[PDB]
Amino acid sequence: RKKVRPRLIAELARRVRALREQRNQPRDSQLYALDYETLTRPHSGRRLPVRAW
Amino acid sequence: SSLPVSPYESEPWKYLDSEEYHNRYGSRPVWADYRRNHKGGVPPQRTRKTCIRNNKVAGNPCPICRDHKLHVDFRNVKLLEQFVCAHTGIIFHAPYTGVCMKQHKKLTQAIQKARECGLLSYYVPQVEPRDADFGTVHGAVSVTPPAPTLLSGEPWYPWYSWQQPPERELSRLRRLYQGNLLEESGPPPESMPEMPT
Amino acid sequence: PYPPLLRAMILAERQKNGDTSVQEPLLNLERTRMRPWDYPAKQETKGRAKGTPV
Amino acid sequence: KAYHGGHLTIRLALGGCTNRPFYRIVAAHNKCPRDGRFVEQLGSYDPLPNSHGEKLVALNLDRIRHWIGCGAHLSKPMEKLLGLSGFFPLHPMMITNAERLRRRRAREVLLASQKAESEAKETEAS
Amino acid sequence: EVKKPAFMDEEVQRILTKITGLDLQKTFRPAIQPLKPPTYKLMTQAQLEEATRLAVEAAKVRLKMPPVLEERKPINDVLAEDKILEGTETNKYVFTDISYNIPHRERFIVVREPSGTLRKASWEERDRVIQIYFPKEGRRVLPPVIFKDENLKTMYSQDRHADVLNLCVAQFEPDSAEYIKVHHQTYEDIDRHGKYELLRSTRHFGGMAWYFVNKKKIDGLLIDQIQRDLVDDATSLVQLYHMLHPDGQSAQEAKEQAAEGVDLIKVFAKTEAQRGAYIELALQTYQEIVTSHS
Amino acid sequence: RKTRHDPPAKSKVGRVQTPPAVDPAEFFVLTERYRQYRETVRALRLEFTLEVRRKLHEARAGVLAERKAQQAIT
Amino acid sequence: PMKGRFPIRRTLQYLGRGDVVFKESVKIMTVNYNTYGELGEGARKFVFFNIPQIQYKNPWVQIMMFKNMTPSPFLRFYLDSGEQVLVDVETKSNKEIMEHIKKILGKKEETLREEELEKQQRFHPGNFGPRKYCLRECMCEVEGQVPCPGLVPLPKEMTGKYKAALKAST
Amino acid sequence: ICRLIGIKDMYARVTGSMNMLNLTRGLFHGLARQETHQHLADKKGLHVVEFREECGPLPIVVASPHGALSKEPEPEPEVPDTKLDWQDVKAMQGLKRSVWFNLKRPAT
RNA sequence: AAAGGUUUGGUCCUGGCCUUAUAAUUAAUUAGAGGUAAAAUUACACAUGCAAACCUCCAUAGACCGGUGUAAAAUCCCUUAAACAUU
Ligand code: FES
Ligand SMILES: [K+]
Ligand SMILES: [K+]
Ligand SMILES: [Mg+2]
Ligand SMILES: [Mg+2]
Ligand SMILES: [Mg+2]
Ligand SMILES: [Mg+2]
Ligand SMILES: [Zn+2]
């Protein structure tokens, strides 16, 4: 073989993306915040099930 | 629209013993003196689909179709034998005898039906019995001791039957699912109710 | 008890192997008893939601 | 395909033609296609009654016991087949569904009797 | 109690093999099948005799008799009766264990009926499904139609009894009622028309002689063996009749007179022969021809 | 089937869950059947797990396995 | 005419006549033989006739042949344990050489039959699937079962087209 | 020609030139110089035995030496030196045949 | 291939091309219905709709199924080791 060549951009992308995750980890106050008028989580827009209202 | 009517329709085997057959065919097969008309030296691998369409006959009728008195019936064994190899017992393919595909399929069914009823002989290989041991004392083919629940008449497992829930537990569910409830169901019928008809 | 077919296969093997007995095969449920469905689960091994806003 | 995650499962693979279904009982990684790559064939199921009026199930009970012992899950249709055979206990919903059918035929019979009684009133009116 | 002789008893197999006979031309008659070009070897008289010896060894294995068994007993065992499933199914389910390394007579084949009963499969059901999943060359899933009484009579007119029996061995099990019915019908037709020669030098002769001895109708086979100058075989048949019926008047008469050879056949004629008058006439004629010519 | 990066439909934004209604007598009977059924099936799955491992050890280090190994060397 | 001398050596039937299947220990078989002489004639025939058959049944064994390196012909087998089995084939017929090596380092008939049976353990006659792997593709082929709709049309009541129409009518 | 001779079952292949005269001369040259079984028994003094697969291991004696039967077995080599035709062997080696081979043809 | 046609004044040799068999697609002309299988110009550009949810909040899933043949002689079979976003 030997025509398979390195992928520097792919390696750089994987590492670089990892750094952003570690620094920009969200917090419990943000992930689990809720809008009680609509019963929907603002961070992700997830609407709670009906049996939990 | 008037195809000829054979006198031997009821008893087809009679024709092959009549003098008319002997004069026309002698002791050779009925397909011996037939040649197919085709371009080239190698013929097509299938014969014509059929020689008779809506009471009309094709240009070069095949051995069966050209002679109307010849009848392909499982009982007419003498005719059927001409289409089976005497040495190998394999039915000849349609190109071999020049019969049309319709009659070849019809002949194959008659040959197989004659063999199934024993009118037409074929070679039966000798095969050993299926099982080396012929004992019938294993539980699979014998009597298994009846289970305790089976003798008493009870279900195999207790939860197979309907067990009325405790009254407190039914109320616990009425609180949990308050506002979205269905009419409470009692014990189901003991047997399957006979289907109304 | 064992299921009806699986019980018959056990009794058949006994007779084939020469073991003569009328004991009823029994399943033991103590080793594999299930927790309630609402039992608290292991939070340490649970996933956490990602930090990409929708 | 090169799957990542998943478990072995025993399920029914649909075969046959249109209006003529036939199933192959197989052990396969759950992420594989229904009729695609499988690990072992453990039997077959013909859901159409034959000339003798019998639906024919074939179970390789030695290999089935082997794969359940190695973590193989079971699909719900296969649990119903193992329950009818007697190799497994009857599935909870097999029992519940049979009870629902009994309660639903009980109503129909009662309605027919009421209709006959209503028809009897029509007979009384003449 | 003196054990009743069996079909596979070394003594019975010896007598049945002898009366059956061997004929390398009949045992190895050409099969009507796809043919291949023959091969040729140059052999001395020593090599040729060695080849004939191997042919006789193979003819012995080819003439191995098929088992003679008593009719199986119907399977009627109910594993369970789950009435909750009554009315939830319209057709019976048949479940077959198809594990490869289980003998077929030790496999579990159960039926879940619409009523909910889980029962063991009958003998007819067991053979049918075992053909569907372990297909045997020669056997068909559904019983063939050649075994109908009218179809069997056609085969008998053509003197195709060895085929009727070879077909009955490929299709049916030895202990099945269909197997016994067909065999007992073929053996009976051979008797009525004196066609004993059809099954000689075949694996089916032993069962035929066995059936006649047990049914006390060896008269025809003795008369035919004597008329063919096979009088050593006829005596062995009377020994087999004196072995399976020890308390019979004929067997007790031979002990009193210590009869041997042709004497045994003469004793049978007077005591237990259904048609003794003919056995003596045929036996006498054989002796006259043998003595007169030689 | 859609990928996680695909945009959601605009005809199903209004969608809200409609939980099934519960029959108290049948829900409880069914909950118990599932608990007892799954315990029986867990007892059978364990027995099958042991037959697999017993057979494996017999093949690996059974009586017959050991004799053949030494028989070959001799 | 097939080229070369004894062209039968280049037929699959001849190559399959070999009976020497080496044990798993055998890894290499070096052949030292002489091209000229009278006591090495059997060795020369063994290289000519038998070495092809041995390699055919033992594809993973390295057979390397050396010519005119020693006064006498011999065979030396190298086993996986590190043992070296020297065999002396001088004044020995090619048939004698084959039988000798079969005895000392050849698998027995019993062992080979067990492997053949084990190889086919996962083929089941009941299994349905493609012709390459299975006898029957579908249960429609079995006698007594419902036939394939393509070959034989199904009854109207067993068809989804018909059942759907009734549900609309109801 | 085979019909005129009376041969009913045979296979033949012709290659090289298709000259009709050379084929007729070549055919009669080969058919008229063949060795019957009775001749082979006399030349070697041994029995000629036939083994058909449809008759099993049954040995069939087709020709016996006219004079004195020998007692020295014919030498049977371990590996014969026969000269083989690639066309004949090619089929048995598993090589795919031509689309024109063994086609369905009318009875000859 | 069981072969055939075709160089010449003629015969023979050599040697190509073509024919006869089988199939797929498109096209011309032609045709009733029914069962079945298959569906295929283009990795060109795309209006519109739909194709992933579930669920007492957490999680899990949307990494599959489905699609195409872009790239690369890229692969097959085999050995060893370790894992899994698993059971
Ligand atoms: S191939 Fe079996 S139903 Fe069509
Ligand atoms: K040419
Ligand atoms: K067109
Ligand atoms: Mg939860
Ligand atoms: Mg078109
Ligand atoms: Mg896919
Ligand atoms: Mg490309
Ligand atoms: Zn015709």
Residue numbers in the entry:
A (entry chain 0): 3 to 55
B (entry chain O): 42 to 238
C (entry chain 0): 165 to 218
D (entry chain M): 10 to 135
E (entry chain R): 63 to 356
F (entry chain U): 27 to 100
G (entry chain T): 2 to 171
H (entry chain D): 325 to 432
Q: Would you copy out the relevant sentences from the publication that reported this structure?
A:
Mitoribosomes are essential for the synthesis and maintenance of bioenergetic proteins. Here we use cryo-electron microscopy to determine a series of the small mitoribosomal subunit (SSU) intermediates in complex with auxiliary factors, revealing a sequential assembly mechanism. In this study, we determined sequential cryo-electron microscopy (cryo-EM) structures of stable assembly intermediates and initiation complexes at 2.8–3.2 Å resolution that involve six factors: RBFA, TFB1M, METTL15, mtIF3, mS37 and mtIF2. In conclusion, the model for the SSU progression through the assembly pathway includes a sequence of binding factors as an integrated network, with RBFA serving as a regulator through its allosteric control mechanism, which was not reported in a bacterial counterpart.
Judged by the proportion of the unfolded rRNA, the earliest intermediate pre-SSU-1 (3.2 Å resolution) is represented by partially disordered rRNA helices (h44 and h45) and two disordered linkers (h28–h44 and h44–h45). It lacks the peripheral mitoribosomal protein mS37, and instead contains the assembly factors RBFA and dimethyladenosine transferase TFB1M. The methyltransferase TFB1M binds to partially unfolded rRNA h45 that is promoted by RBFA, while the mRNA channel is blocked. TFB1M is the methyltransferase that uses S-adenosylmethionine (SAM) to dimethylate two adjacent adenosine residues, A937 and A938 (mouse numbering, equivalent to human A1583 and A1584), in the hairpin loop of h45. It has a CTD (residues 237–314), followed by a CTE (residues 315–345), forming an additional α-helix that together make a large interface of 2,077 Å2 with the rRNA h23, h24, h27 and h45. The C-terminal α-helix, which is disordered in the crystal structures, further links TFB1M from h24 to the platform rRNA h23. In the SSU body, the N-terminal helix of the mitoribosomal protein mS38 is disordered, and its mature conformation would clash with TFB1M.
